[PDB]
């Protein structure tokens, strides 16, 4: 038995179209902008820049360790060892995917502190740009507004070159000095 | 859609079929080394174990009673009258 | 996103920052 979603659509006999997934912002049916949470409320897609993601997972495993000990009653290279220890505590251990993920995240995160990831998240989610771009803008370090618009091609006409270049400056300024 | 307990209208008594199926199911589970919710007073046959569990209403099963429209009323074996 | 809300404390009862000497005409 495998996992299901909040997307209920009834594909009766009519198999296909399964139209390709590209950054023409045409992601899956599953990674659509209009999502639905377990409380039925229509809620927007949640995309994470690897740092926003690093923090989320760390937070979740930290809180899990709490309940695991409760139910039992009756510097980056330094973060890697610290995280690899938390994984030994909460995770199934067979889950090697999370181990690599956490290592990659620790080594590639642009913003260390939660405070930092807070401003990143503000500055960006005010552009009206779709969660995918807003994440790739947070996770890909670009200098020219062309570097950005080339790598994130979906952006193309969505933002001024200057407006994007102004953002790229105040993004570089937020980067935690590793 | 699932009928609320306060609005249930099916028999408060267990049907012959329900009882036969509960006894069948428990006996099957008991036989597949499932945990037994009663003191086996020397018992070894899983049906006689099932009978005993139902006799003391220590069977943790629920009957989902479907109505012709598709809706249903859930009834606990603990709550169903066994006049059979 | 530094923390969440911003910590009030606003104060006019503090030590003091103003002196006084040109009172005389």
């Amino acid at each position: 038995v495998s996992t299901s979603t909040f997307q209920t659509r009834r594909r009766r006999l009519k198999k296909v179209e399964e139209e390709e997934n590209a950054a023409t912002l045409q992601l899956g049916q599953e990674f659509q902008l209009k999502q639905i949470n377990h409380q039925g409320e229509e809620e927007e897609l949640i995309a994470l820049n690897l740092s926003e993601a690093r923090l989320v997972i760390k937070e979740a495993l930290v809180e899990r360790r709490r309940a695991f000990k409760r139910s039992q009653k009756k510097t980056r290279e330094k973060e890697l060892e610290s995280i690899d220890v938390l994984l030994e505590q909460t995770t199934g251990g067979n889950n090697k995917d999370l181990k690599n993920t956490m290592q990659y995240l620790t080594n590639f995160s642009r913003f260390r502190d939660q405070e930092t990831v807070g401003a990143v998240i503000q500055l960006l989610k005010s552009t009206g740009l779709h969660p995918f771009e807003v994440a790739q803008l947070g996770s890909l370090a670009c200098d020219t507004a062309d570097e950005a618009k080339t790598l994130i091609p979906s952006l193309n006409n969505k933002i001024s070159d200057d407006e994007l270049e102004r953002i790229l400056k105040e993004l570089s300024n937020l980067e935690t000095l590793y | 859609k699932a009928i609320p307990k306060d609005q249930r209208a099916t028999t408060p008594y267990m049907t012959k079929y329900e009882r036969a199926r509960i006894l069948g199911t428990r006996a099957l589970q008991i036989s597949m080394n499932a945990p037994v919710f009663v003191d086996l007073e020397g018992e070894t046959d899983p049906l006689r174990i099932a009978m005993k569990e139902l006799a003391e209403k220590k069977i943790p099963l629920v009957i989902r009673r479907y109505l012709p429209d598709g809706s249903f009323e859930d009834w606990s074996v603990e709550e169903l009258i066994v006049d059979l | 996103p530094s923390y969440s809300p911003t910590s009030p404390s606003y104060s006019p009862t503090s030590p003091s920052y103003s002196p006084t000497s040109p009172s005389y005409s």
């Binding site: - | - | 606003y10 104060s11 006019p12 503090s14 030590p15 920052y17 103003s18």
Partner: protein, 56 residues
């Protein structure tokens, strides 16, 4: 309040400190000299560089 710059009771141990130095009203020529002398102290501090080589 919100537009005011001052110093607190603070300015006072700032005086305790200022008066703790060896100076105050003797002017420019003698003062420039003290600067060269403090610089000589920093140069004698380089001596720390020499001794650090020894720690080796």
């Amino acid at each position: 309040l919100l537009r005011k710059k001052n110093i607190p009771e603070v300015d006072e141990w700032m005086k305790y400190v200022r008066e703790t130095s060896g100076v105050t009203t003797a002017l420019l020529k003698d003062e420039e000299i003290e600067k060269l002398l403090q610089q000589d102290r920093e140069i004698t501090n380089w001596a720390r560089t020499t001794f650090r080589n020894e720690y080796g």
